[PDB]
Amino acid sequence: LRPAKIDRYVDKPAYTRREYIRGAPGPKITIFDMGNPAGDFEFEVSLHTAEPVQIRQNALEAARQQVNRYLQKNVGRSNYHFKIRVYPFQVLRENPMATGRKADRYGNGMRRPFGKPIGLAARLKKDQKILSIRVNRQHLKFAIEGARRAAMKFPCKCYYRIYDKEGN
Amino acid sequence: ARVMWTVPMAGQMGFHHRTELNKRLIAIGENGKLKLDENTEIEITPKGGFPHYGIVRSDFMMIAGSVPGAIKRIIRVRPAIRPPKKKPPVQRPQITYVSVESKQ
RNA sequence: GCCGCCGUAGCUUAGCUGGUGGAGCGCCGGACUGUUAAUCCGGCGGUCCCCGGUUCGAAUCCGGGCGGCGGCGCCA
RNA sequence: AUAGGAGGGUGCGGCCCGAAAGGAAUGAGCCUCCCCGAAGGAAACCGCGGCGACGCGGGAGUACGAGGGGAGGGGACCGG
RNA sequence: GGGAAACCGACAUGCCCGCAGCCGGGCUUAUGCCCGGUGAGGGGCGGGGUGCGAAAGCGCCCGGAGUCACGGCCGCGAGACCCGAAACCGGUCGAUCUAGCCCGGGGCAGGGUGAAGUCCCUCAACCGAGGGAUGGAGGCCCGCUAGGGGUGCUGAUGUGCAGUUCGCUCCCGUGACCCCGGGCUAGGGGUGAAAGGCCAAUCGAGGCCGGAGAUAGCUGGUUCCCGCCGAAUCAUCCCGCAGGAUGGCCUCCCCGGAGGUAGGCGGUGGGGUAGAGCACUGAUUGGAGGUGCAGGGGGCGAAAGCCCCCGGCCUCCUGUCAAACUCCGAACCCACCGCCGCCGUAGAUGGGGGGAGUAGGGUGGCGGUGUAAGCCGUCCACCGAGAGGGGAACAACCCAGACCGGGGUUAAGGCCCCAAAGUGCCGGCUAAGUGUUACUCCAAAGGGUGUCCCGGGCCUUAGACAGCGGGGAGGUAGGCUUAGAAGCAGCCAUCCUUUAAAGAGUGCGUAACAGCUCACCCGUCGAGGUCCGGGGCCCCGAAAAUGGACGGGGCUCAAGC
RNA sequence: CCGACACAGGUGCCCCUGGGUGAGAAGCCUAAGGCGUGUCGGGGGAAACCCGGCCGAGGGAACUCGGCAAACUGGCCCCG
RNA sequence: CACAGGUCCCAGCUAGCCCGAAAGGGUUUGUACUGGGGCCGACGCCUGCCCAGUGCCGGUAUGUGAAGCCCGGGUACAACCGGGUGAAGCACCGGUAAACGGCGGGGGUAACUAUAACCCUCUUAAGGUAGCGAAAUCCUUGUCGGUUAAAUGCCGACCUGCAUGAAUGGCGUAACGAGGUCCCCGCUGUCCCCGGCCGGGGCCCGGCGAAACCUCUGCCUGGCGCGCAUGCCAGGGACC
RNA sequence: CUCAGGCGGGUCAGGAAUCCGCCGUAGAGUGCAAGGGCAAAAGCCGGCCUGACUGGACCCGUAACAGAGGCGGGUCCAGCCCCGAAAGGGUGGCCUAGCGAACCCCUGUGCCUCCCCGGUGGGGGCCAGGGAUGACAGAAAAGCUACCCUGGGGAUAACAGAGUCGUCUCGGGCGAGAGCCCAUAUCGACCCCGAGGCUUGCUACCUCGCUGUCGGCUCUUCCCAUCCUGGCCCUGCAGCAGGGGCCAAGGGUGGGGGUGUUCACCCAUUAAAGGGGAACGUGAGCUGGGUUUAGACCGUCGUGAGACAGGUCGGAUGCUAUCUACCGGGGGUGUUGGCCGCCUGAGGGGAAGGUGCCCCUAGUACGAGAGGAACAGGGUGCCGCGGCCUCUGGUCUACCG
């Protein structure tokens, strides 16, 4: 996994449709819902995306984990409900090249520069809900902290922030 | 695409001005050749002169170590601006013996 | 990273037009033998590597995947 | 013999000349008065606004103005 | 004239438009105009000839203009605007260089070693043993003899002394040696102790002459001026992509002759890209409620049992979003008409004929690929091939499309000096010399009780905002866990009583009863207060190589933003 | 002579037994014989630098791909 | 490279091989102890195994195999059509590797951990033998040892050789070499670290007198620009 | 005439084929990719039938617009059939892939023709079908060249530069977790964002009428993200010694052993033995070992020629400075009429100095002990640097033996 310098843009086009193309990659995310059902709470905090991006399957799993881990330890899974709504669908492409030097290329311009699948990504526009956590007002302070931690691993930035829905 | 001035080349060497610091004044007297007292010199000058210098007969000074210049050149003497301080000056240094052989 | 080719009884190998499945080896139960070896009858397990698809049905024919075999990895 | 570069073009000083092929003594460089005059176009000064910078009306399409005509003085070069 | 040939054989005009002109009327002072005939030239039918053809239907042709001459443009063949190489081939000429072969001659200081061969003495029957002599061989040694070679110095030279040299050092130096003269072998041939070496300053096939002005899609060059118009660097085909041809396009001449439709409005049509979403094709994320079912785990299992059970297969309200999905669907492009506009009778629009040119770049938009720069499409101002003015300079950013000379006024952009023009004006930001750079010139997430300004809450003598004086309950050591977990590893419950007030406890402290302390609270001082959340701007983040620089200086209530 | 040049090149013989030397047609010196036209001179005690060459303490290849270059040994007699 | 030595091959001279347009010719005043052609390259010890493939050679009933002739047909003749006859050649058989060349893979197993003397299997003719080997072996500075204080070296050894091996010669070798590499002793300006000297140049004068090459010129730095500038742009230095 | 699939009844272990009813706008099917078309059909079933017929056109595609061959198709009309009651349809398969020339030969039919003329054989020709060029608008066609040669090209590789920055280096944020309790003394996953241009790769902008390769040597400048030195902060900082961070380029940053080696490995020292840029600094300076000539060998490959970034021995390093650059040296002008001598000091340069050791402190502070500082005051050593030759070395072509 190369550094993200292509997952930070949406000016790159679509190549989602896994059935259509020969060769598709696996996921890394399996777990998306955690805690109690979302009908046992009143208030809704979201993290809102203010920038268009593509968010990597790797970043989604990492960000969720570090967050969910903090919520689980302090609060317990007897309280809160946390969801990261998105599934990544956008397939990502690679030009083959590694060190080999000397007379060797590696390479290569064309001769099939066309992707082998790296991964998957989720397309996040402006005012989307990247995270939605459900809480009570006892459990407010934990949900905000967790969201702050999310935002760094967001490919660009937030500018709409940590948002009180309030729960309408 | 130039030549620096710090790269080694031929040109003048010598006939350059130099100030060398902290040379001890061994001695002052006048003559030379004979003095009637036996301490603070007994009097100088090798016989046969020196190679490339005339007769010494007038007031003189004998200074420690190297003096910058050629034989027969005018030298001027400058008091020190400050001398060592980890090594004190001590007045009239004790002169055990003076040469009397020629440089040749 | 490229381009060929495999995997089939515990092992090694035949085989396939898509309607099949063996051999030698090991192993197991009897039998010669005093016992045993050798020898000698009786056997069996195979999704014919994973995973899609077409078909009325795929071990076989195409897609993909995995491990193992060769051949280029250079005049530049 | 303190001063910047495709070695020049364009415009103007200094010095230099120019009899000859050019215009000019039947008047050159030059001076001065008057008028006509395309496009353009003020000021002083007056009154009133504008927080201010500054603007309007009148002066006034006047003064001025490329370009054109007449007269007049001086007296030798002017272009090149 | 048609047909391959056999072979056959046509309109000196039947019909209709209409340009020019003629003829007529109307009209304007006139030219000129509007409308009706007549209409050569021209345009459109019919009928005709012939070929194919049972036939039909087309193909080609049909109501008389060409020939010759002169100049020039252009194509092709020729040397073919000019020059330019490596070849190939044919006939010739070299072995005074050099290679080997042959005849006949010659050269090579000195020194060493010491074979065979031969001899003798002493000692032994013999076998032999010891010693010495003599002789003199060698593709032999030493050797800067002459002579031959040429290893190292990578030295000297390296426009030399020299187009292959010099000195020291070094190899050979009676030989498979060197050398002279004569003589032999010649170019796909010789010769080669064989390196593709050598065969006369020329050898992976010598030289000379001729073919020969070879031919090259390839490099270079192609010469007087002026005026007018003024490109394409695309497409299809190609042993073709460094080239041709043919179109688009550019330009020139001629012809016919009344419209033509770049722009905009409306009408009538075409359409699945933006966007959007569950409506399909249909990929996928997540948990409830149906318990409609194909089966891998368990149970009273008396045994596929009656009965429930758990991956799960698929309805439902819901749950993520989908180049190559679509219930839908813009802006927008495009066909035709009408209208207006515009353009034309100083002839457009269309037709025929002569001449080319088939490396692109580039900002931006929209892309496709690609981490990117770049590549490749597409439209695109523009550069090519277009100055001038401005962006410091700067192919393509901005302004602008340029006959000469003059007067004037603005554009772009700028008004602190350089350098024309503002020490402009109002208000606000700024303390970084941020910036003074739309450019080709322009660095981020994160983050600052740094400022300035909008929000709606809390809340104010029912005054904690900070200080300050006193605080800091009981079950309970919560239990588990565990040595201990006694608020204070960790897990989970996190409740109940009593009130300044009290968290199954904030940090310290023991590893774990304790101790210090907090949230908290009445409260003194007697107020305008604490929050949180958007925004502008400035700060941190922010290190680079000969000199650092916003163009420079320098600027800080500006000459900045 | 030949190499375009009066080219440090390179082409045969003969004098190969001159004297001294010493194994010697060797070196050096020297005789007969030849020449001072291996054809440009002079100056600076002549510095840097370059070619030939001489000498370097102490250390004894640490240099460098490498003891390359250079040095050392040295003739002859005896022992072995 | 030659080379002596070794081997394979061919030819009965009216030969073989080779030259020549031809006549004719070389070897050859030669005759198998000849003379022609290859391979290997002194000596010492040796030279395994394969004829599947290539090549060469000998032979070939049979099939097959041209033109000619023959027969049939056709044509008034001819072209023409068909069959037999069909030589070398091919298919076919054998020999032949000091001819060109080849000379393999997996698994399982031993008092104990290791390995496997051991045993299976199959291609394609045969299955690497005597030897030698990390090489004039990739990985790689293998590993161990010698050697150096310290050595990606050298040398010795092991050896599983990425990709050795027997006349496309293997191994080993006294003597020999202006051959490649390594060590030791002496020695030594190669070096630490350079100096001084000497002679010829340099440098000046007198006389004599060329060439290479030639848009121009007093810059430096940055920026820009065909992206590696004296000349554009902005600074600075600047008398010849 | 209407289907996949699903439901309920039937048979079976289940299930199949088979059976009955109900739902069911297309999920079926239509040869075959894909897409498009279609439900009283083009699908399904059954019967009949053979138009995938002959001739000759228009038009379109091919090849938009816009020239363009072969090929295909729609669409007429004539002729001959077919089917259907008829209308009416049939120019092959619902559409879009299944494509093939000049010339030649063979086929088939009818017709022309073969040199004075007739007849016969055997020819030519008009037309159509069929036989190949899959490199598919059709040549008849294997390799090597480091022995090369030529025409050219930076329209295009190697090298260096520029651009870029995946990789590379470095840096930042978040903070899962470990460190005795304690995220942040220290260590730090997942993930995310930047800077540089020092490795590699991408690019083809520059250069192919030659900007000479590496490495080394020698010589000099610069950069800091700093190895030491100086001045500092934190600490799981007792000391002494570390770890981690800041400031800082003034100075220093070595010698050897292997390798062609930049790198790297090792030895012994050292305060420390930092990294990177300058045509991967440095060939009109050297060196020329290595890379990539022409000789040769081995291994592999190849029939062979012959090849190899496989291994290996050997393999030349040109030039008299016109301009400019600097080091040094002259001759003169300008500084306002000239001159002889002495000064000032705008400015320019610098490292002239760097660094270590030892003694005293002190066997002290601190420490259980082992061990063991500092301030301050002295002495020295080395490296760099400038002068000097008396001492002592070197030389000394004065000279003497």
Declared resolution, Å: 6.6
- Determine the distance between B83 (CA) and E223 (C1') in angstroms: 89
Which residues 111-150 on A are within 7 A of strand E at the CB atom? 113-115, 123, 128, 148
Distance CA A55, CA A129 (A): 13
Protein footprint on strand H: which nucleotides are under 7 Å from a CB?
166-167, 173-177, 189-194, 200-204, 219-221, 309, 325-329, 378-379, 386-391
Pairing of strands A120-124, A53-56: antiparallel
Cβ-proximal residues to B73 (8 Å cutoff; 6+ apart), any chain: none
Exposure string over B58-91, b if 16+ CB within 10 A, otherwise e: eeeeeeeeeeeeeeeeeeeeeeeeeeeeeeeeee
Cβ A155 vs Cβ A60: under 8 Å: no
- Whether the beta carbon of A89 falls within 7 A of nucleic chain E: the reply is yes
Alpha-carbon distance B84 to A74, whole Å? 73
* Pairwise CA distance, residues A110 & A117, whole Å: 17
Beta-carbon count within 10 A of A10 CB: 16
Distance B64 CA to F30 C1' (A): 63
Is any atom of nucleic acid chain C found less than 7 Å from the CB of residue A96?
A: yes
CA of B11 to C1' of H221 (A): 22
Torsion angles phi and psi, residue A133, rounded to 5: -120, 150
Tokens coding B81: 């601006």
Neighbours of A89 (CB within 10 A): 14
User: Would the CA dihedral through A129, A133, A134, A138 be positive or negative?
Assistant: negative
Sheet containing A53-56, strands listed edge to edge, beginning at the edge strand earlier in sequence = A53-56, A120-124, A90-91
Distance CA A79, CA A135 (A): 8
Long-range contacts of A108-114 (CB under 8 A, 24+ apart): none
Give me A78's structure tokens: 């007897």
Query: Does residue A68 have a cis peptide bond before it, meaning omega lies within 30 degrees of 0?
Result: no
Nucleotides in chain G with any atom closer than 7 Å to protein CB: 219-221, 229-230
Return the closest nucleotide (C1') to the Cα of B1.
H325
C-alpha separations of A38 from A42, A129, A134 in Å: 9, 16, 7
Determine if strand E comes within 7 Å of the CB of A87.
yes
